[PDB]
């Protein structure tokens, strides 16, 4: 809908902005941590194997 702007009529922008920032940061950190803990998607390990760094 084009009437989604009315969300700012229900909630204060500062509250929502802080909540969204915290949520996005936590989600990004969690996904990066999950990928790093998996050896098949740890990009440092993949780079080491591909380029023969060690």
């Amino acid at each position: 809908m084009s009437k989604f702007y009315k969300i700012w009529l229900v909630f204060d922008p500062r509250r929502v902005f802080v909540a969204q920032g915290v949520f996005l940061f936590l989600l990004a950190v969690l996904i990066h941590l999950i990928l790093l803990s998996t050896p098949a998607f740890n990009w440092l390990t993949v780079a080491t194997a591909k380029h023969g760094y060690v």
Binding site: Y5, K6, W8, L9, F11, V46
Partner: protein, 43 residues
């Protein structure tokens, strides 16, 4: 109705700014996902 005291015009302006920011963020995320899929697909 209004719980925050903002007028409808102010709400529309704030939403326009927020949607511009959200569109930029989502576009960057989509580009990153395309790059990851090309480099190392997970499906």
């Amino acid at each position: 109705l209004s719980f925050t005291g903002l007028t409808d015009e102010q709400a529309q302006e704030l939403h326009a700014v927020y949607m511009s920011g959200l569109s930029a963020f989502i576009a960057v995320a989509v580009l990153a996902h395309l790059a990851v899929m090309i480099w190392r697909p997970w499906f």
